Amino acid sequence: QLVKAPIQVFGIEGRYATALYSAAVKQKKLEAVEKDLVQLNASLKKFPRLGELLKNPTLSRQLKKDAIGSMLKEQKAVDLTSNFLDLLTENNRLKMVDGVINAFKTIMAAHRGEVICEVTSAKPLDEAARKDLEVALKGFLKPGQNIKLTLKTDPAIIGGLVVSIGDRFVDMSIGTKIKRYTAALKTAV
Protein backbone atom coordinates (compact mmCIF):
# COMPACT_ATOMS: atom_id res chain seq x y z
CA GLN A 1 0.00 0.00 0.00
CA LEU A 2 1.27 3.44 -1.03
CA VAL A 3 -0.33 6.83 -0.49
CA LYS A 4 -1.45 8.46 -3.74
CA ALA A 5 0.69 11.43 -4.76
CA PRO A 6 -1.01 14.79 -5.43
CA ILE A 7 0.23 14.63 -9.04
CA GLN A 8 1.64 11.84 -11.17
CA VAL A 9 5.40 11.98 -11.75
CA PHE A 10 6.79 9.69 -14.43
CA GLY A 11 10.02 7.80 -14.97
CA ILE A 12 12.20 5.81 -12.61
CA GLU A 13 13.19 9.06 -10.88
CA GLY A 14 9.52 9.81 -10.28
CA ARG A 15 9.06 6.30 -8.89
CA TYR A 16 11.69 6.99 -6.22
CA ALA A 17 10.13 10.38 -5.46
CA THR A 18 6.66 8.89 -4.98
CA ALA A 19 8.13 6.16 -2.78
CA LEU A 20 9.85 8.78 -0.62
CA TYR A 21 6.69 10.90 -0.49
CA SER A 22 4.55 7.92 0.53
CA ALA A 23 7.00 6.91 3.26
CA ALA A 24 7.24 10.48 4.56
CA VAL A 25 3.45 10.96 4.65
CA LYS A 26 2.82 7.63 6.40
CA GLN A 27 5.03 9.11 9.11
CA LYS A 28 4.95 12.80 10.08
CA LYS A 29 8.16 13.91 8.36
CA LEU A 30 6.87 15.49 5.14
CA GLU A 31 8.20 18.96 5.98
CA ALA A 32 11.46 17.65 7.45
CA VAL A 33 12.42 15.46 4.48
CA GLU A 34 11.63 18.33 2.12
CA LYS A 35 13.85 20.74 4.06
CA ASP A 36 16.98 18.59 4.08
CA LEU A 37 16.52 17.53 0.44
CA VAL A 38 16.37 21.19 -0.62
CA GLN A 39 19.40 21.91 1.57
CA LEU A 40 21.17 18.86 0.12
CA ASN A 41 20.41 20.01 -3.44
CA ALA A 42 21.62 23.52 -2.56
CA SER A 43 24.78 21.97 -1.11
CA LEU A 44 25.39 19.96 -4.29
CA LYS A 45 24.89 23.03 -6.50
CA LYS A 46 27.13 25.18 -4.29
CA PHE A 47 29.87 22.50 -4.32
CA PRO A 48 30.14 20.90 -7.79
CA ARG A 49 32.95 18.63 -6.56
CA LEU A 50 30.40 16.67 -4.52
CA GLY A 51 28.15 16.24 -7.56
CA GLU A 52 31.04 15.00 -9.70
CA LEU A 53 32.06 12.64 -6.89
CA LEU A 54 28.62 11.05 -6.50
CA LYS A 55 28.06 10.75 -10.26
CA ASN A 56 31.49 9.16 -10.80
CA PRO A 57 30.88 5.49 -11.72
CA THR A 58 34.50 4.52 -11.08
CA LEU A 59 34.30 5.16 -7.33
CA SER A 60 32.98 2.34 -5.17
CA ARG A 61 29.60 2.65 -3.48
CA GLN A 62 31.22 2.42 -0.03
CA LEU A 63 33.05 5.69 -0.73
CA LYS A 64 29.79 7.19 -2.00
CA LYS A 65 27.73 6.24 1.06
CA ASP A 66 30.51 7.47 3.35
CA ALA A 67 30.61 10.80 1.52
CA ILE A 68 26.80 10.95 1.55
CA GLY A 69 26.73 10.05 5.25
CA SER A 70 29.41 12.59 6.16
CA MET A 71 27.58 15.41 4.37
CA LEU A 72 24.16 14.35 5.69
CA LYS A 73 25.07 14.40 9.39
CA GLU A 74 25.48 18.17 9.09
CA GLN A 75 21.98 18.30 7.57
CA LYS A 76 20.55 16.62 10.72
CA ALA A 77 18.71 14.12 8.51
CA VAL A 78 17.36 11.42 10.79
CA ASP A 79 15.82 8.35 9.21
CA LEU A 80 14.02 8.81 5.89
CA THR A 81 16.48 10.85 3.82
CA SER A 82 19.44 8.81 5.07
CA ASN A 83 17.72 5.59 3.99
CA PHE A 84 16.65 7.26 0.73
CA LEU A 85 20.23 8.14 -0.23
CA ASP A 86 21.43 4.74 0.98
CA LEU A 87 18.91 3.20 -1.42
CA LEU A 88 20.11 5.49 -4.22
CA THR A 89 23.72 4.39 -3.71
CA GLU A 90 22.76 0.73 -3.20
CA ASN A 91 21.48 0.81 -6.76
CA ASN A 92 23.27 2.69 -9.53
CA ARG A 93 20.71 5.48 -9.23
CA LEU A 94 22.59 8.32 -7.52
CA LYS A 95 23.71 9.58 -10.95
CA MET A 96 20.30 11.30 -11.07
CA VAL A 97 20.15 12.54 -7.48
CA ASP A 98 19.15 15.90 -8.95
CA GLY A 99 16.35 14.17 -10.86
CA VAL A 100 14.68 12.61 -7.83
CA ILE A 101 14.98 15.84 -5.83
CA ASN A 102 13.40 17.85 -8.65
CA ALA A 103 10.63 15.26 -8.93
CA PHE A 104 10.12 15.38 -5.15
CA LYS A 105 9.90 19.18 -5.34
CA THR A 106 7.18 18.79 -7.97
CA ILE A 107 5.17 16.48 -5.70
CA MET A 108 5.39 18.83 -2.72
CA ALA A 109 4.44 21.87 -4.80
CA ALA A 110 1.17 20.13 -5.66
CA HIS A 111 0.86 19.04 -2.03
CA ARG A 112 0.50 22.70 -1.07
CA GLY A 113 -1.66 23.24 -4.15
CA GLU A 114 0.70 25.75 -5.76
CA VAL A 115 0.13 26.35 -9.48
CA ILE A 116 3.00 27.71 -11.56
CA CYS A 117 2.19 30.93 -13.44
CA GLU A 118 4.43 32.34 -16.18
CA VAL A 119 3.65 35.86 -17.41
CA THR A 120 5.75 37.31 -20.23
CA SER A 121 5.78 41.04 -20.97
CA ALA A 122 7.85 43.13 -23.37
CA LYS A 123 8.99 45.53 -20.63
CA PRO A 124 9.04 45.10 -16.84
CA LEU A 125 6.41 46.97 -14.85
CA ASP A 126 5.18 47.17 -11.26
CA GLU A 127 2.68 49.05 -9.06
CA ALA A 128 -0.43 49.22 -11.26
CA ALA A 129 0.62 46.25 -13.40
CA ARG A 130 1.59 43.91 -10.57
CA LYS A 131 -1.47 44.71 -8.43
CA ASP A 132 -4.03 43.86 -11.11
CA LEU A 133 -2.02 40.87 -12.39
CA GLU A 134 -2.10 39.25 -8.94
CA VAL A 135 -5.88 39.68 -8.70
CA ALA A 136 -6.40 38.47 -12.28
CA LEU A 137 -4.27 35.39 -11.61
CA LYS A 138 -6.07 34.80 -8.30
CA GLY A 139 -9.37 34.57 -10.18
CA PHE A 140 -8.26 31.26 -11.71
CA LEU A 141 -7.70 29.77 -8.24
CA LYS A 142 -9.95 27.14 -6.77
CA PRO A 143 -10.06 27.23 -2.95
CA GLY A 144 -6.89 25.87 -1.39
CA GLN A 145 -4.45 27.18 -3.99
CA ASN A 146 -1.28 29.27 -4.19
CA ILE A 147 0.33 31.22 -7.03
CA LYS A 148 3.96 30.75 -8.05
CA LEU A 149 4.53 33.71 -10.38
CA THR A 150 7.51 33.95 -12.74
CA LEU A 151 7.92 37.15 -14.75
CA LYS A 152 9.84 37.20 -18.03
CA THR A 153 10.98 39.89 -20.45
CA ASP A 154 11.19 39.38 -24.22
CA PRO A 155 11.19 42.11 -26.90
CA ALA A 156 10.38 39.62 -29.67
CA ILE A 157 6.66 39.75 -28.78
CA ILE A 158 6.53 43.55 -29.43
CA GLY A 159 4.14 44.10 -26.52
CA GLY A 160 0.98 42.63 -25.05
CA LEU A 161 1.01 39.88 -22.43
CA VAL A 162 1.89 36.19 -22.72
CA VAL A 163 0.47 34.56 -19.58
CA SER A 164 0.70 30.82 -18.95
CA ILE A 165 -0.71 28.57 -16.21
CA GLY A 166 0.21 25.02 -15.21
CA ASP A 167 -1.55 23.57 -18.24
CA ARG A 168 -3.35 26.50 -19.92
CA PHE A 169 -1.86 29.18 -22.14
CA VAL A 170 -2.92 32.27 -24.07
CA ASP A 171 -1.02 34.44 -26.56
CA MET A 172 -2.63 37.87 -26.12
CA SER A 173 0.45 39.65 -27.43
CA ILE A 174 0.94 42.27 -30.12
CA GLY A 175 3.45 40.27 -32.17
CA THR A 176 1.22 37.23 -32.65
CA LYS A 177 -1.91 39.35 -33.13
CA ILE A 178 -0.46 41.36 -36.01
CA LYS A 179 0.98 38.12 -37.41
CA ARG A 180 -2.43 36.48 -37.81
CA TYR A 181 -3.89 39.74 -39.13
CA THR A 182 -1.22 39.88 -41.84
CA ALA A 183 -1.92 36.20 -42.53
CA ALA A 184 -5.57 37.19 -42.96
CA LEU A 185 -4.44 39.92 -45.38
CA LYS A 186 -2.49 37.45 -47.53
CA THR A 187 -5.32 34.88 -47.47
CA ALA A 188 -8.11 37.43 -47.97
CA VAL A 189 -8.44 37.31 -51.77
Place this chain on the structure above:
Amino acid sequence: ISAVLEEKILGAAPKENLEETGRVLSIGDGIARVYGLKNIQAEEMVEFSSGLKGMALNLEPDNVGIVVFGNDKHIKEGDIVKRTGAIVDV
Protein backbone atom coordinates in the same frame (compact mmCIF):
# COMPACT_ATOMS: atom_id res chain seq x y z
CA ILE B 1 33.63 24.35 8.66
CA SER B 2 31.93 23.92 5.29
CA ALA B 3 35.16 24.07 3.27
CA VAL B 4 36.86 21.75 5.77
CA LEU B 5 33.98 19.32 5.24
CA GLU B 6 34.58 19.53 1.48
CA GLU B 7 38.28 18.78 1.98
CA LYS B 8 37.43 15.85 4.26
CA ILE B 9 35.03 14.35 1.71
CA LEU B 10 37.34 14.84 -1.29
CA GLY B 11 40.35 13.58 0.68
CA ALA B 12 38.87 10.09 0.83
CA ALA B 13 38.37 9.86 -2.93
CA PRO B 14 41.61 9.68 -4.94
CA LYS B 15 42.66 12.77 -6.87
CA GLU B 16 42.45 12.29 -10.64
CA ASN B 17 42.92 14.58 -13.65
CA LEU B 18 39.89 13.54 -15.69
CA GLU B 19 40.72 16.06 -18.43
CA GLU B 20 43.86 14.14 -19.42
CA THR B 21 43.29 10.73 -17.78
CA GLY B 22 40.44 8.28 -17.33
CA ARG B 23 39.38 5.02 -15.74
CA VAL B 24 38.05 1.96 -17.56
CA LEU B 25 34.37 1.28 -16.93
CA SER B 26 33.84 -1.81 -19.08
CA ILE B 27 36.18 -3.78 -21.34
CA GLY B 28 35.09 -6.50 -23.74
CA ASP B 29 35.76 -7.78 -27.28
CA GLY B 30 38.40 -5.12 -27.88
CA ILE B 31 36.19 -2.18 -26.85
CA ALA B 32 37.00 -0.18 -23.72
CA ARG B 33 34.49 2.26 -22.24
CA VAL B 34 36.36 4.78 -20.09
CA TYR B 35 35.14 7.48 -17.72
CA GLY B 36 37.14 10.68 -18.06
CA LEU B 37 39.40 12.05 -20.80
CA LYS B 38 37.41 15.27 -20.84
CA ASN B 39 39.67 17.09 -23.32
CA ILE B 40 40.32 14.10 -25.59
CA GLN B 41 39.87 14.45 -29.35
CA ALA B 42 38.20 12.08 -31.75
CA GLU B 43 40.48 9.47 -33.40
CA GLU B 44 43.12 10.29 -30.76
CA MET B 45 45.61 7.71 -29.51
CA VAL B 46 45.51 6.66 -25.85
CA GLU B 47 47.78 4.62 -23.60
CA PHE B 48 46.52 2.02 -21.14
CA SER B 49 48.10 1.01 -17.84
CA SER B 50 49.40 -2.23 -19.39
CA GLY B 51 51.11 -0.34 -22.22
CA LEU B 52 48.49 -1.16 -24.85
CA LYS B 53 47.53 1.56 -27.30
CA GLY B 54 44.00 2.53 -28.26
CA MET B 55 42.00 4.98 -30.34
CA ALA B 56 39.00 7.02 -29.22
CA LEU B 57 36.30 6.36 -31.82
CA ASN B 58 33.18 7.30 -29.82
CA LEU B 59 33.12 10.38 -27.59
CA GLU B 60 29.86 9.82 -25.76
CA PRO B 61 28.58 12.26 -23.10
CA ASP B 62 29.13 9.71 -20.32
CA ASN B 63 32.12 7.69 -21.55
CA VAL B 64 34.64 7.31 -24.38
CA GLY B 65 34.55 4.28 -26.64
CA ILE B 66 38.11 3.13 -27.30
CA VAL B 67 39.20 0.41 -29.73
CA VAL B 68 42.08 -1.58 -28.24
CA PHE B 69 45.25 -2.17 -30.26
CA GLY B 70 45.77 -5.66 -28.86
CA ASN B 71 44.42 -8.42 -26.66
CA ASP B 72 41.94 -7.07 -24.11
CA LYS B 73 43.01 -9.55 -21.42
CA HIS B 74 45.59 -6.97 -20.29
CA ILE B 75 42.88 -4.38 -19.53
CA LYS B 76 40.64 -4.47 -16.46
CA GLU B 77 37.90 -2.24 -15.12
CA GLY B 78 39.41 0.64 -13.16
CA ASP B 79 42.67 0.92 -15.12
CA ILE B 80 44.18 4.33 -15.84
CA VAL B 81 43.99 5.47 -19.47
CA LYS B 82 46.08 8.49 -20.47
CA ARG B 83 46.01 10.82 -23.46
CA THR B 84 48.76 10.56 -26.04
CA GLY B 85 47.55 13.97 -27.25
CA ALA B 86 47.68 13.43 -31.01
CA ILE B 87 46.03 11.50 -33.81
CA VAL B 88 47.66 8.29 -35.05
CA ASP B 89 50.80 8.77 -37.14
CA VAL B 90 53.32 6.37 -38.66
